[PDB]
């Protein structure tokens, strides 16, 4: 696909007293590393997240609804989606190419104009 990174002072505090918004999909990076990890929940919170993961596979979850799942806010309910997206894809295995390999599956290009 297409990706893009840089590093910059104004990652941080650059807006944060003038103007509030919410998008599908911006930044990667809270504080210099690319999202951390949480499990911050209440046993019954804790079950009613895993519950639905397990029943949807990580894949069909959105923060709309998962903040409405555990009665949370969507900036909690996209953090989940943001910090813990593989753990529940396929991880218990020694070899994968090392993101690298481009055969048999993304056999294609694309060009400029």
């Known amino acids: 696909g297409s990706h893009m990174a840089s ?3 104004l990652d941080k ?3 944060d007293i003038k103007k509030e918004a919410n998008d599908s999909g911006v930044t990667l990076a809270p ?9 911050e929940l209440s046993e019954q919170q804790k079950i009613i997240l895993a519950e639905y993961i397990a029943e949807v596979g990580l894949q069909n979850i959105t923060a709309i609804t998962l903040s409405k799942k555990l009665n949370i806010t ?7 989606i943001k910090n813990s997206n593989r753990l529940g894809r396929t991880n218990n295995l020694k ?5 690298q ?7 294609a290009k694309s060009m400029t104009w």
């Open 13 to 15: 505090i650059i807006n």
């Open 7 to 9: 590093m910059d002072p």
């Open 31 to 39: 504080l210099s590393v690319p999202k951390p990890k949480l499990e």
């Open 74 to 80: 969507v900036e909690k309910a996209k953090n989940y």
């Open 101 to 107: 390999e481009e055969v048999s599956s993304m056999e």
């Open 95 to 99: 070899t994968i190419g090392i993101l």
